[PDB]
RNA sequence: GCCUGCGAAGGUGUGCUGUGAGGCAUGCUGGAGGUAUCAGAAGUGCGAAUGCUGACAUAAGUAACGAUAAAGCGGGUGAAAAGCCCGCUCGCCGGAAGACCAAGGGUUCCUGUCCAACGUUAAUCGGGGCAGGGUGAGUCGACCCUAAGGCGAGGCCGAAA
RNA sequence: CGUACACGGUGGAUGCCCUGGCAGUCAAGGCGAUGAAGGACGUGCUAAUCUGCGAUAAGCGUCGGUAAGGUGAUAUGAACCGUUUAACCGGCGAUUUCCGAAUGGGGAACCCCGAUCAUUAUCCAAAUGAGGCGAACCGGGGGAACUGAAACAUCUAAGUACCCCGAGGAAAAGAAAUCAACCGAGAUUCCCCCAGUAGCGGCGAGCGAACGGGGAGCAGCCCGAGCCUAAUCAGUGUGUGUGUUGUGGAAGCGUCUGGAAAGGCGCGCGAUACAGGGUGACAGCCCCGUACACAAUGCACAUGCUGUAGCUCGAUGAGUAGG
């Protein structure tokens, strides 16, 4: 997701997104579980995404 | 200067004649041209030199003194590849003297 | 819900448990008090937990020579469900 | 104003010259620079302070290892076993080398794999080296309180910590 | 077993090199209650250190620059990012945990609040100040001794060492009830000189100016009443130059030696560009770079402008002069 996408989203859409992403990062906690399916990319992106939406939420 | 985006033409080493694109430039002054490689033990097309060894520094290690990018002069070398968005660099590139 | 947890558990130790005895192992965040770990569990896991216990651990320095250790491990927490079902999969 | 990888400076051995300080040549090594003249610049040329620091020889392969004085005979494993393990025999300690703890120390605990270093001999042993694993209380303790006494604030004194 | 040498060793000197120091010069110069400096603990797939950040954690966003590669020092393995143009280098904004001047209270970083002093005061902390830090410079106070005098009580070292309080980027002084070669000079510091002179001193040892002159730099002005107003005050617009840093880009012959020439010899060339570095050996013409020009940042001080506003009359400051 890019800043452009978040801005277009509605106030509610940014809330459901943050909650959904928070859901992602958590299932991503499988790192400790030593899961294979895991991938460092999205793991590091989820924290940025939830951050971006959070910052734009403030911009609003 | 030399850029990894420029195609080079060897002229001295045993790889004299081979054409290829640079893969990276080191602070040491050695350049690796795409195509100039060696055959490892288990037959793996990986760039390097020649002599028995263990962990090692990749790249065939080529000297800029024996390579051939653009070089206005009576030589045997021919065409070479080269940014453009600069504009001013386009004028120099257009001049048979600068680049 | 989906806010605090890490690895379900490990080999023997966190295996002898959950075998048949109603108890579950799971790595929980350090900041995680008792409010959660009885929510974010019992919520996700198809069950209801009663007693809750959050442990704390950490190794230390040394182990080598003229190097540096100074660090700190991290701590999972046991949480007994209730006479029902064990998470609905992992276990016995 | 000259020399040099058709090889310098330095070093080792050797030849020659000067009363000498010193200069110079040859061979080997080395393998990069090094001089002569005149005119300067100098943190400029040493055996000789129970001198300072580091290194090293002789002394010497010489002085030293003892109340919980305990090991011995078979066997197992192993390339190797006087001190790793099994059995037997024989002993030591008893307010104690027994059991539970405070302070203090702090992973040194357990398992597996090893041993170059450590264990004043050896080690297939280890509190040694490496990699993992371990310390799950409402009623135990902390947490809470106060004693001698201390501190901060107001009051009072060139000034003030 | 004595000595010299040879081969090998020990050892590390020596010779050469040096990504370090030492010294000088030019430029530039403050940081913090919108809570800093420092420290602690964290943060990278693996990371123990250092560095960078800090839980949006060796990073996120915007603009500009730059450029096709890159994922800090580490040139590992895996993997990933980049042309929806990243890496990397520069302005402004957002976020900015806890302690810390912290300031509720206690406390070896952990638990609950504008603490203390003070001003204004709608006396409600309601509106504000102080309480810390910073290499050493300037100012204001307190003030030794060893030592010299070849003893020592003046003197000397000292008004130094050390103690206290406070400012700035700079401080103190200053327009003369002065000087005193005169029908003369004429605000104050500082530099040179005058002087090692005048003067002081068991006149023993030692101590020690000033006026003036030559320079640097120059500026003079404010308190009772009358009257009236272009100094001041408030606000607006808002730079030049200069200084610092960053940025744009082509080109290599012959013979000999050599593994390779940036060698020797021969020939030729550029220069508002007779710095340096790199490149298989001493390359001004092989590459960067240097003239040149551009860009960013700081400078921002100033100037211009709006509304304010002259000038006049008298006196001139006692517990002081002085004892």
Which residues sit opposite B63 in a β-bridge?
B30
Supply the DSSP symbol for B13. Answer: S
Cβ proximity of A56 and A8 under 8 Å: no
- Resolution reached, in Å? 15.0
Token pair in block for residue B59: 């790249």
Residue pairs between chains A and C whose CB atoms are closer than 8 Å: 19
Question: Residues of A with CB below 8 A from C1's CB?
Answer: 23
Q: What is the rounded CA–CA span in Å between residue A37 and residue C17? A: 26
Find which nucleotide's C1' atom is closest to C52's CA.
D136
Q: What is the rounded CA–CA span in Å between residue A33 and residue B80? A: 53
The b/e string for C50-60 (b: 16+ C-beta within 10 A; e otherwise) is eebebeeeeee
Instruction: Say whether C6 and A31 touch across the interface (CB within 8 A).
Output: yes
Breaks (C–N over 2.5 Å) after residues, chain B: 82
Q: Say how far A51 CA is from E125 C1', in Å.
A: 40
Cβ proximity of C78 and C45 under 8 Å: no
């Amino acid at each position: 997701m890019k800043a452009k996408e978040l801005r277009e989203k509605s106030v509610e859409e940014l809330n459901t997104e943050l909650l959904n992403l928070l859901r992602e990062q958590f299932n991503l906690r499988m790192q400790a579980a030593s899961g294979q399916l895991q991938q460092s990319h999205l793991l590091k992106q989820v924290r940025r995404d939830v951050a971006r939406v959070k910052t734009l939420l403030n911009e609003k | 200067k030399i850029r990894r985006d420029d195609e080079v033409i060897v002229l001295t080493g045993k790889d004299k004649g081979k054409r290829g694109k640079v893969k990276n430039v080191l602070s040491s002054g050695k350049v690796i041209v795409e195509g100039i490689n060696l055959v490892k033990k288990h037959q793996k097309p990986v760039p390097a030199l020649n002599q028995p060894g263990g962990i090692v520094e990749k790249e065939a290690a080529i000297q800029v003194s024996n390579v051939a990018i653009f070089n206005a002069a009576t030589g045997k070398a021919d065409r070479v590849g080269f940014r453009f968005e600069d504009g001013k660099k386009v004028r120099f590139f257009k001049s048979n003297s600068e680049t | 819900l989906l806010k605090v947890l890490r690895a379900p558990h490990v080999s023997e130790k966190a295996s002898t448990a959950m075998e048949k005895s109603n108890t579950i192992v799971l790595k929980v965040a350090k900041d995680a008090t008792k409010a959660e770990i009885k929510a974010a569990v019992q919520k996700l896991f198809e069950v209801e937990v009663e007693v809750v216990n959050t442990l704390v651990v950490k190794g230390k320095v040394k182990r080598h020579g003229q190097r540096i250790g100074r660090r700190s491990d991290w701590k999972k927490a046991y949480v007994t469900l209730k006479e029902g079902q064990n998470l609905d999969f992992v276990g016995g």
